[PDB]
Amino acid sequence: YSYVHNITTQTNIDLSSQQTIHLASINGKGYIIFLRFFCEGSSACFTNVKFSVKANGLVLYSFRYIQLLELGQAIATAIPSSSQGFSTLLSNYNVLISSPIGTLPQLTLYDSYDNRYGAMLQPAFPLPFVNTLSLDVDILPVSQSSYDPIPYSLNDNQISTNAPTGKGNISIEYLLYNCL
């Protein structure tokens, strides 16, 4: 067996309507051990980019950053009732950091000033994958205003008409333990 540690990149991405980008692909059996997902560029990293991790064609993970914040996998907050919810959170705070993870991913880095976003993932036991492991990024522009974060299927391609846009660059770090 051997460790496989790598960083894959796409350095100039249009965050426009309905693109599908295939970042990296790994052959062979192994165990997922550590994952990190990063986006930089305009603020359109936060809402429009959906990360996906598949093993043998079967979907393991699929998420966004605003899905990780709005479904509570982020820094623990508590908002007074005389507010507008999350619209009062992202409008007032610039940088949000949160360290402890477990198996499900967490929004570890929110940086609206420097405009860097990131999430991490550490399984509590090594997650096996048999045939291939694939990493995908889907650009689906959806505004912050509604988005309906409670999921109803895996393949929900939801968009809006006044979503923010721009250019940005997307990186994924992974550490696996493959076979020979």
Partner: protein, 178 residues
């Protein structure tokens, strides 16, 4: 100078299976005036059907075996490298994202006006689906004002198998012999 030996190695070995050998042009270009650290050039290949594979990290299609053989730098770049208008350095050639396979010897020495133009040591094989990635490691970076991005062209020999009797069941049997 290694292209003519790997070409006849492709025309002899692939023809019992059906083998359609041709050459295409690959372009690597780091954007926006590298001046400090290790940069990432944007790959760009041009295959048959007006298919422009772009961005980083090209994937070889499922019926082809590529061969990255040679490289050269044009004269309007080489007059800028010696004037310090763009960075010198080498280009690292990766296969499957972790394995480093070659290093291009000092792209100012790959100019088309050097009477001793340096070539590559050996051409690198790229099987069906396998990620090709490159990086630019600058030694003597750009110091002058109004700098320019780098551009280093390559040369790919493609061994196609789509026009045999079977596109999939035959390429995976010539991949073992080449």
């Amino acid at each position: 100078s290694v292209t003519q030996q790997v070409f006849n190695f492709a025309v002899t070995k692939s023809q019992p299976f059906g083998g359609y050998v041709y050459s295409t042009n690959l372009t690597a270009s780091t954007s926006s005036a590298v001046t400090s650290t290790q940069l990432t050039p944007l790959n760009l290949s041009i295959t048959l059907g007006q298919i422009t594979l772009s961005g980083n990290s090209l994937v070889i299609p499922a019926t082809q075996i590529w061969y990255l053989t040679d490289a050269y730098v044009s004269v309007p770049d080489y007059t800028n490298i010696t004037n310090g208008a763009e960075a010198d350095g080498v280009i690292l050639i990766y296969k499957d994202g972790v394995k480093l396979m070659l290093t291009t010897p000092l792209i100012s020495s790959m100019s088309i006006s050097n009477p001793a133009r340096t070539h590559l040591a050996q051409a690198v094989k790229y099987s069906p689906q396998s990620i090709l990635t490159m990086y630019f490691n600058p030694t003597k970076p750009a110091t002058a004002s109004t700098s320019y991005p780098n551009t280093v062209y390559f040369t790919v020999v493609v061994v196609d198998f789509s026009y045999a009797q079977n596109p999939a069941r035959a390429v995976v049997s010539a991949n073992a012999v080449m």
